[PDB]
A paper describes a structure:
Here we present the crystal structures of the FjChiB chitinase and the FjGH20 chitobiase, as well as a small-angle X-ray scattering (SAXS) envelope of the novel FjChiA_M domain.
The remaining GH18 chitinase of the locus, FjChiB (endo-acting), was active on chitin and CHOs, but to a much lesser extent compared to FjChiA. To investigate these features, we pursued structural determination by X-ray crystallography and were able to solve the structure of FjChiB to 1.63 Å resolution. The asymmetric unit contained one protein molecule without contacts indicative of oligomerization. The overall FjChiB structure is similar to other structurally determined GH18 chitinases, having a (β/α)8 TIM-barrel fold and containing a CID between strand 7 and helix 7 of the (β/α)8-barrel (residues 249–286). Electron density consistent with a formate molecule, likely from the crystallization solution, was found in the active site positioned by hydrogen bonds with the hydroxyl moiety of Tyr205 and the carboxyl moiety of Glu150. The orientation and position of the formate molecule is similar to that of the acetyl group of a GlcNAc unit bound in the -1 subsite in several GH18 ligand complex structures. Relative to SmChiB, a processive exo-acting enzyme that is amongst the best studied GH18 enzymes, the binding cleft of FjChiB has two distinct differences, described in more detail below, which leads to the cleft being more open and exposed to the bulk solvent.
Numbering used by the authors: 36 to 344
Write the structure that this text describes.
């Protein structure tokens, strides 16, 4: 059947924007991010129960996961990760803590967003053990992975354990490469990422194509980020292009292209990050929703979608 996922990341710092986010257009919501403290306990700064209560009242079928780690972790958090998963004898208590967090907060799964250097030697054993805990409790286990790099510390059993993966098909350049002044999330980069993970023997259905609701401003040597919402505030005439001088993002036509491509080549679309959108008429989440509906794909089945599915 014509169906697709629409997986949205929501940062803790975005919680006061949830009344503007159309959760009826998502199938999955990832709350970002929880991280371990010095004691092996998962810390989340924010009223996650209030958020999930509200979200489930908007879309009672949404699948809500806690996302772990994330792109921005402190040296202390990264060291706690390494201490907890790189020594197999430290994993047991941490794993129980993760499972109890999922139960205590009535969540549907866990998303692993350990990135780059935080993908340490214990990653695969951690994933395999956590996978069993969650499978046995009928919960999801997913991961966000880089566009076109296979980390040595992600073995095949771990990679295949995930219910699906979220390809981070963006950040091809950024503030860490301030002289590569160009698009950070081109259509070609997205296609490269999908093809790459298929070459890793991940089936199409288990791929989710990430798209960015932000861009980078290379005007000065210090590169800054701009949300799509901020770009539209600068002018609605910018909604349908990808570049303003040295600012590079994804406008509506390019998001639309990526949705058309995803419909034929992956199991869905992933969004970083929901509260960066332009809420209302120019919304990129709306572009995704409308395009999947026009293609006759079921996503949420709400708010106009999947009428004749």
């Amino acid at each position: 059947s014509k169906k697709a996922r629409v997986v949205g990341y929501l940062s803790a710092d975005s919680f006061d924007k949830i009344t503007s986010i159309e959760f009826c257009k998502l199938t999955h919501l990832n709350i970002a991010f929880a991280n371990p403290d010095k004691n092996g306990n998962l810390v989340f700064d924010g009223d996650i129960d209030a958020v999930t209560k509200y979200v489930r009242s908007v879309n009672s079928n949404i699948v809500i996961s806690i996302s772990l780690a994330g792109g921005v972790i402190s040296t202390e958090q990264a060291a706690n990760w390494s201490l907890l998963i790189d020594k197999p004898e430290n994993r047991p208590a941490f794993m129980q803590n993760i499972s109890k967090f999922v139960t205590d907060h009535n969540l549907d799964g866990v998303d692993v967003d350990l990135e780059w250097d935080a993908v340490t030697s214990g990653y695969s054993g951690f994933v395999v053990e956590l996978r069993k805990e969650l499978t046995d409790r009928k919960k999801l286990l997913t991961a966000a992975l880089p566009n076109n790099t296979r980390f040595v510390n992600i073995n095949s059993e771990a990679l295949n354990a995930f219910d699906f993966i979220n390809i981070m098909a963006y950040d091809s350049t950024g503030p860490w490469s301030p002289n590569k002044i160009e698009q950070h999330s081109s259509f070609e980069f997205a296609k490269e990422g999908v093809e790459f993970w298929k070459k890793q023997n991940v089936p199409s259905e288990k791929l989710t194509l990430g798209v960015p609701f932000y861009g980078y401003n290379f005007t000065y040597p210090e590169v800054t980020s701009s949300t799509f919402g901020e770009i539209i505030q600068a002018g609605t005439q910018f909604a349908d292009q990808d570049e303003i001088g040295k600012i590079y993002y994804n406008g509506r036509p390019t998001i639309l292209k990526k949705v058309e491509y995803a419909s034929q080549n992956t199991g869905g679309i992933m969004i970083w990050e929901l509260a960066q959108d332009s809420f209302g008429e120019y919304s990129l989440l709306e572009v995704i929703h409308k395009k999947y509906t026009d293609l006759k794909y079921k996503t949420s089945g709400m708010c106009g979608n999947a009428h004749h599915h």
